Amino acid sequence: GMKRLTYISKFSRPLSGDEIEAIGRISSQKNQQANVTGVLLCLDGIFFQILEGEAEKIDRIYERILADERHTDILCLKSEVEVQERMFPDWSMQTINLDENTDFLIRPIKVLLQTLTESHRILEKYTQPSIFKIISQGTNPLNIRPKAVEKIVFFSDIVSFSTFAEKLPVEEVVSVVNSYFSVCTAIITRQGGEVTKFIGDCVMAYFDGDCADQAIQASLDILMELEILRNSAPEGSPLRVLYSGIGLAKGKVIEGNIGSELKRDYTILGDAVNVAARLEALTRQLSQALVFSSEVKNSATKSWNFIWLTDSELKGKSESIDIYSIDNEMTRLEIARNIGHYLERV
């Protein structure tokens, strides 16, 4: 059946009007051979494209388009599955270069398009990466039916964050937290997790319920990167005393259209506050940078060097759960007093 994608992208490099003409002419030739139709517009370094045709052919062309080095920041705004008729039946690929168009009525429209796209790019930064994935799969996020799914939940925090905020100017605190968040988000994403929110200095993320190995690997990689960061920072850098505690648990997450008219969310983990606070307490109490429950340990498939540490309570239920870590050089209140002294004289 027929599929129609709409996406926007950014010129990765300046492109002349003749290069854009060539892109359109090659696309028209290739699309004609594939029975694909659509339209390509450019304006001030932005591409807009609509492609329609057999789902199979569309997905293969779009993969090729994703790899084309001449644009970047590809965002699919809309994916329509089960499309009934073509919008552009006579256009294998029609190319409309708006930079070159001087028509009277199109001038205000170009301003509007530019403004909508730019506002769209701002909003893209402040939205959960996971809404865009639902869109790309062809569903309106506001119309998802609720579902409960087991996840591995990741929480990490900054040791003695309050000391940073007390001892450094706000711009330096923000530089520290942004380095932290950048390290965590990059590694979690590369291991297939999704960061769902920042709660103060705490990063909250999900992994699929059978992806314990990926969650553990991501945790170890974060610890290794922070060690590299502390060692390699300039003399006197506040980054030298950036440490993190990480906890992993298993939870039942609800996915759906959650919230109010004023604010929506895609997912809810009930009592997230309490699980995170209990895991931060464990990492301090055990002086262990990584702790996780037996449920996480039992969902793993690789032969990790597990070490049993203690019993604890993670959910408000009075169930006593075994807490494990990984026994390696990395993982092998203390840090808080060191933090303050160092930050005092930098």
Ligand X SMILES: Cc1cc2nc3c(=O)[nH]c(=O)nc-3n(C[C@H](O)[C@H](O)[C@H](O)COP(=O)(O)O)c2cc1C
Restricted to residues 208-247, the positions that interact with its own copies (CB under 8 A) are none
Residue from 50, 65, 205, 220 in contact with ligand X (CB under 6 A): 65
**Residue with Cβ nearer its own copies (179 or 307):** 179
250 DSSP β-pair partners: 152
Pick what 115 binds: its own copies, Ca ion, ligand X, none; C-beta below 5 to 8 Å, kind-dependent.
its own copies
For position 335 contacting its own copies by CB under 8 A, the verdict is: no
For position 61 contacting ligand X by CB under 6 A, the verdict is: yes
Rounded Cα distance, 273 and 279, in Å: 10
308 DSSP β-pair partners: 324
Q: Quote the least distance from Cβ 184 to its own copies, whole Å.
A: 8
Taking CB under 6 A as the binding criterion, the range among 22-30, 82-90, 135-143, 212-220 that sits at the site for ligand X is: 22-30
Q: Is 18 annotated as a binding residue?
A: no
Residue from 5, 40, 226, 314 in contact with ligand X (CB under 6 A): 40
Restricted to residues 123-182, the positions that interact with Ca ion (CB under 5 A) are 157, 161
Taking CB under 6 A as the binding criterion, the range among 58-66, 133-141, 183-191, 258-266 that sits at the site for ligand X is: 58-66
Rounded Cα distance, 60 and 58, in Å: 5
For position 165 contacting its own copies by CB under 8 A, the verdict is: yes
Q: Is 68 annotated as a binding residue?
A: yes
Backbone interruptions in the chain following residues (C to N > 2.5 Å): 332
Rounded Cα distance, 339 and 346, in Å: 11
Q: Quote the least distance from Cβ 177 to Ca ion, whole Å.
A: 11
Contact 274, 303 (CB under 8 A): no
Q: Is 162 annotated as a binding residue?
A: yes
197 DSSP β-pair partners: 204
Contact 37, 95 (CB under 8 A): no
Sequence-ordered alpha helix ranges (H) in the chain: 17-34, 55-67, 106-125, 129-136, 161-167, 170-190, 212-232, 272-286, 294-299, 335-344
Task: Cite the annotated binding site for Mg(2+) by residue number.
Answer: 157-158, 201
Residue numbers in the known binding site are 30-31, 49, 64, 68, 70, 157-158, 160-162, 201, 270-271, 274, 280, 284, 311, 322
